[PDB]
Amino acid sequence: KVFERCELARTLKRLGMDGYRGISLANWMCLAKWESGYNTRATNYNAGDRSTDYGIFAINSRYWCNDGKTPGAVNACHLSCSALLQDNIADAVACAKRVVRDPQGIRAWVAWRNRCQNRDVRQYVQGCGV
Hints:
The protein has helices at residues 5-14, 25-36, 90-100, 110-115, and strands at residues 43-46, 51-54, 59-60. It is of the alpha+beta class.
């Protein structure tokens, strides 16, 4: 499913993402926008290390979910990577929360550092009623 901006903002808010570990809803939106274009079916294979980024938050198989085909990978969110390809983003949100409980927080995603860190991200939530 490809979310429309405000639809996603409210969906994330209802799922408890606003201010989760200090991360604003606008930061989560900027992350999803640059990681998948709000596409829950987005996938990116990384030929270099044989891992795959899954879903709306492009969560990687080397550490976060299990797809059975990633060399020496772990599964910190304890989910099949298939759970990260559902139209319903509850499991993906649960996993994203797990990612940020680690030391780096939102910085875990390099894309956030590149496209969201120290940027004006107000535009992501304006007019969404969140």
